[PDB]
């Protein structure tokens, strides 16, 4: 049993506001653990800064999943380099490659709240809400359970209601809404599932 010899895989970073960055990753292959993993360290620093990396400890014994961690308390509109390491009972393993990501210039809108209105054999009607302070528009996301996500871009000036048309009958669709801002796209709402009538 030794320290891991491989970096985490499938690293993905995305800034979710002026102060926060969402980091996703997967574990290294089983052949590079050398001892069951106890967790990870997520490293971050300002891109060119001479200061060293700051590491956040993320405990994750559960594996076979996509791990994610929300860095917070960051600086507005600045670029950071992000890495992730793995560790076990023995020492820490090697870090992943750097992903450089910039924080946003402002706060994103809150995730909307979606609710079902009605459903027919070929249509589904949906309401949503703001709980916002300035929103610039929305996007409605829908799919059939077995299919791929389709997108309906929308304007904030309209009524916050929409009716999907031309749908298959006796088919379960999933629906959710995202809000839009000058600074970017907010988190998604919860996914509404409903089946069309026969």
Numbering used by the authors: 389 to 521, 525 to 589
Text of the article:
Recently, a shortened Dscam (sDscam) gene family with tandemly arrayed 5′ cassettes in Chelicerata species has been identified, which encodes ∼50–100 isoforms. Chelicerata sDscams could be classified into two subfamilies, sDscamα and sDscamβ, containing one and two variable Ig domains, respectively. Crystal structures and cell aggregation assays demonstrated that both α and β subfamilies of sDscam used Ig1 for the isoform-specific trans recognition in a hand-in-hand manner. Furthermore, the cis interactions were established by the three FNIII domains of sDscam, which assemble into a cross fold with a kink between FNIII2 and FNIII3.
Thus, this kink conformation may reflect a physiological geometric assembly. The inter-domain interface of the kink contains a salt bridge formed by R404 and D578, and the hydrophobic interaction mediated by L492 and L496. The cis interactions are mediated by the FNIII domains that are constant within the sDscam subfamilies.
